[PDB]
Structures are given as C-alpha cells and as structure tokens.
Amino acid sequence: MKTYVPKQVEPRWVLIDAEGKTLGRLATKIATLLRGKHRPDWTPNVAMGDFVVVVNADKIRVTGKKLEQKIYTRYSGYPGGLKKIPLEKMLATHPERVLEHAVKGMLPKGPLGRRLFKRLKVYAGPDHPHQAQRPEKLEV
Amino acid sequence: MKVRASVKRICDKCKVIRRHGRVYVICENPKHKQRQG
C-alpha cells in the first residue's frame, strides 16, 4: 500500500478577530491554518491549507516594552540604507504589517511558502471585503 | 553632573535616588549631583 495523497479540494475560508490577542501567539496558529497542518490529509508539497482573514489587526496586543523597543528593519542596498522602525510607529502607520511580518516569518521559505502567505488576508478595523467567500468564524 | 562608574553619597545631605533604570545622586549641593555611567 502507498500513502494517501489527496486530489484538489475546495479550500476553507476562515475569520479571526485579532483584537486583544498576543501578536506572536496568534501568529503561530494563523501559520498552521495556512500550512493546513490541522488537516488529516496534510501534504507538504501542495497548497491545501485554509484562507485566513483577520480583522482588528490594529488591536493586536504585545507584552513587555515591545511597543517602544521592538524594531522593524529594512535595508535598501544603498550606503547607509538601514531603516529602523519601532512597533509603536508601525502600528500608527501600517498596523496590518505587524501581524503580516509575524506570520510571514513563521511560514516556510520558498515558492510554496510565498503562496501560503498570499492566502493571508489581514485587515485593520473590524470589517473585511470577503463577505462573498463567507469565511467561517474561528475561535483561536 | 558627574558621570562615573562609582556614584556615592558625598555629604549627609546627599541622596541616592534611582530613576529610569539609572542610579542618580541628587543633593542640595549642585556639585554633588551624580549619574552612574
């Protein structure tokens, strides 16, 4: 007998209210959903995990002094081109980037991992535009 | 302000305060003001 490999299935859409949740600990679960490792027919070389919609990403929560002390970084290729941005400011300007960077780092590197990240839809504010897909509310 | 590794009371009116992660010594005598560093 050879191991079961699934034919393509309809992917599940899914909703998560990020409000008051701890950045990293939420991130971990979103990644799992994304990889689809909650599914007994999990297959490592195809995209068969869920689509994950997140709302209230601006109301993510963080412990210690990471608001002032956590630094996001960007190198431009140019001399002196390392930009440093604190959590506080990232939230004040692009709050969904906070959760986006977090999940992205916990996805695999490579062509598949990048596809999985595209299946993450993160939103600041309580609304999202995907009522069409009718995502299923998740408690995490 | 004096900035040293060893900040100490200099007179009986000196006071060892600690603010914002740093040890200071404040006092009536401006010469005795110290910050550890």
Binding site: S76, G77, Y78, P79 | -
Partner: protein, 204 residues
Amino acid sequence: MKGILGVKVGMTRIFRDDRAVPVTVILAGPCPVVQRRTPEKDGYTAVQLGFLPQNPKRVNRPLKGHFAKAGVEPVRILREIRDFNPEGDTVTVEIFKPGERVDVTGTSKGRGFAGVMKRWNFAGGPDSHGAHKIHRHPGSIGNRKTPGRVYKGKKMAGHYGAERVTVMNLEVVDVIPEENLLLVKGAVPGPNGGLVIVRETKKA
C-alpha cells in the same frame, strides 16, 4: 495650491528701479479644465488642465471622447495640478500677480551620455606629470576584498539631463494677460519651446 501649463519662450532682462533683472518669458495661458479629480471618485484632489489647441484630424477616438465629456476643443497637452480647484472652467495667467513667488517645472536639456566630469563635477586626472589616458576618468570606484563590490548609487558616467527639474521660489516680475505672458526672474529648466508648469511656491 494653484498652477498652470505653459511653454518657455525665451530670456531677457528688463529694467526696474534702475536695476537690470534677468527674466524668462513664459506663455502660460489659457488652460481649460478638462477633468477634476475628486476624493469620492479618485481618492485625491486635482485639476486636469489642457494646453495648446490641436488639429482634430490628429486626435484619436478615445481621446476625442475624453475631451467631449468636458466640452472642450481638442488640446495638444494634458496635465494635472494637485490640490487646486479653480472656480471657473478656464485657468489663465491672471492667477498670478507680480510679486508672487512661484515654482517652475520643466524638462532639463539633454546631454545624452555624460562623462563623470560634466555629470558629477569630478576632478578627472592630471594633464601632465605622467597621467596615462586618464584625464577625464573617475579614479577608484571602490575598496578591495571588503566589501568587494560597488555601492548602489555610485556616481558614474551615463545619461544626463532631459529629466524633470523644478527650481523654486522665482519672483513673478510681471504678467501681461492680454498676451498670456508670465515674466519670471531668473532661469527656468529646459529649452525654448519646452513645456513648463508654473505652480504657486511652497517656500515661506
């Protein structure tokens, strides 16, 4: 903000209070508004201006349509001014009175492939004392094994000019509305006959 399209016509000096003042003459008017960008519709605020009349025999169907919805004779050049919303449906040089300072944008003259000396004012090499075929060369372009590469942005030979340039805070010296003329003190980018933009200045 306020602005207008125009062509640079040429330079002179005039006399004012027993002073010679260098001027560039700009033919600015008249510019019909042909579309307005609104926050409800476009997400920002601006006016699409038209400039210079065009032979309708040259204006294709998608363009013809655009003009028509605005009821405007076909025009040769279409350009936007941001955060500017004039009462009328035609912008003329009269939005500027003498004494105002403006910012002028044009397309700088094109020097094509420019050596490192013309482009970046490098010093080049010596012209005697042994200099070997390096008189206009740039010298070293790096270090050694650390970092073992050349920085992004390293000033080097390459094309120069024919690029957008805005010089700022030019005095409006006069305006001659019966002829759509603006007199601006000093120098404006680009050749005579070049299209320019004249906006109200951003300096204080």
